[PDB]
């Protein structure tokens, strides 16, 4: 009963970071060797576990979150980080136990003339809590005057696009991120190495 990580890492379509996807992985045997030994990743930072000893561990559940951000935003996908992605789009808790995996996806997610389908949240009345997902599209009041759900001066749509083009600098190129959460509860473990 192999854990279907291939559904997550090799999915054809990835979500925008503001509407990030989550797959709950239970009752299976995971082989993390196929990932950390893989050379396809530009980022593979783990927290609370040593990545090279992952197969010797056992967790209640494992969560795979995936989305697209741009290259210079990958550093924000870590505990304690700040910025519009970490504060308004995807937040990790301080006590995070898991791994953050990313790789350049310029060929899949950039388009001639720009790919404007990937969005991020630019405005919010408060920071996200850890693992919070906000898909609202309410007009944001940035100034003195209320907006009444319509765009006006200092009344902005809260989402913005990247516009990925293949010729972009690598820091502005799209990156696909998978965040594995290793959940340990007071319950029988259901996801283990081989």
């Amino acid at each position, epitope marked *: 009963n192999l854990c279907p990580f291939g559904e997550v890492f090799n999915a054809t379509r990835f979500a925008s970071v503001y509407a990030w996807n989550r797959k709950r992985i239970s009752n299976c045997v995971a082989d993390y060797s196929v990932l950390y030994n893989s050379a396809s990743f530009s980022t593979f930072k783990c927290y609370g576990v040593s990545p090279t000893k992952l197969n010797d561990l056992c967790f209640t559940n494992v969560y795979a979150d995936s989305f697209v951000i741009r290259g210079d935003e990958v550093r924000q996908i870590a505990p304690g980080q700040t910025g519009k992605i970490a504060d308004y789009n995807y937040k990790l808790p301080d006590d995070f136990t898991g791994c953050v995996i990313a790789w350049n996806s310029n060929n899949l997610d950039s388009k001639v003339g720009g790919n404007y389908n990937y969005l991020y949240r630019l*405005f919010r009345k408060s920071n996200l809590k850890p693992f919070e997902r906000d898909i609202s599209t309410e007009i944001y009041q940035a100034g*003195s005057t209320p907006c009444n759900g319509v765009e006006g001066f*200092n009344c902005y749509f809260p989402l*913005q696009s990247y516009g990925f083009q293949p010729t972009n600098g690598v820091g*502005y190129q799209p990156y696909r991120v998978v965040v594995l959460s290793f959940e340990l509860l007071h319950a029988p473990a259901t996801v283990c190495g081989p």
Partner: antibody, heavy 116, light 114 residues
Framework: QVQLVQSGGGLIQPGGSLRLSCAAS????????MNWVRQAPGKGLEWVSI???????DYADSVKGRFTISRDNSKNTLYLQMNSLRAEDTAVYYC??????????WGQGTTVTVSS | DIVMTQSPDSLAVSLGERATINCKSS????????????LAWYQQKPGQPPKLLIY???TRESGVPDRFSGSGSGTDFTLTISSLQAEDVAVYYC?????????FGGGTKLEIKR
């Protein structure tokens, strides 16, 4: 990388019309607020118009009834249609994004000379 | 309209010395609820568009050298260059983004004193 590239403009007679264009990359115009700002030779900056994400616009009194903004979403381009031009409209015309804390990115500018 | 008034119109500062530009708004641009001054400073050099230097009266845009700083609140604001460089010779504008119409100051020309 947010970027604005301007096009159009040039020489026109009083009463004529010109169409200025402003193409954006790195962000979506129809998700942002965009300004037109003009600067007469040797003078300061004068705000001309603002265009919100829905396509509606607000104008300064000095150009209302004569200037109109249209947009091409697929081309991510904003257009300033200037009709009934006068010599006092001679200026360099900029497009600039109304970020929530100011005009953060500007086009390179377009010279408009109204003269007979 | 909110009228922006800069002073002086021209300022001459020796290289390596401190430059101070003032901007005044006819009414306050201080939003009571978030305590933010809706005021920005721009630097314009000939043939170029203006460049954002300071916003929220005192927040530096990324990439602006440390010698640039902004101060003030309500109706009176100030832009300070701690140590003048030859590259800082330009025209500087204030601008309120509190209410329409958006208005700039008349501009302050910064030059080298000899």
């Amino acid at each position: 990388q947010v970027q604005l590239v301007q096009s159009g403009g040039g020489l026109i007679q009083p009463g004529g019309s010109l169409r200025l264009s402003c193409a954006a990359s790195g962000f979506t115009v129809s998700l942002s607020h965009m300004n037109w700002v003009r600067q007469a030779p040797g003078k300061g900056l004068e705000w001309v118009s603002i265009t919100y994400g829905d396509g509606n616009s607000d104008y300064a009194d000095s150009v209302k009834g004569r200037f109109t903004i249209s947009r091409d979403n697929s081309k991510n381009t904003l257009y300033l249609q200037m009709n009934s031009l006068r010599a006092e409209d001679t200026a360099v015309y900029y497009c600039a994004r109304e970020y929530y804390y100011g005009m953060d990115v500007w086009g390179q500018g377009t010279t408009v000379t109204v003269s007979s | 309209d909110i009228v922006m008034t800069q002073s002086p119109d021209s300022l001459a500062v020796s290289l390596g010395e401190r430059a101070t530009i003032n901007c005044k708004s006819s009414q306050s641009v201080l939003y009571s609820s978030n305590n933010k001054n809706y005021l920005a400073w721009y630097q314009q050099k000939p043939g170029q568009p203006p460049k954002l230097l300071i916003y929220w009266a005192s927040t530096r845009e990324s990439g602006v050298p440390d010698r640039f700083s902004g101060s003030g609140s309500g109706t009176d604001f100030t832009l300070t260059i701690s140590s003048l460089q030859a590259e800082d010779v330009a025209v500087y504008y204030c601008q309120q983004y509190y209410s329409l119409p958006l208005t700039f100051g008349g501009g302050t020309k910064l030059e080298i004193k000899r």
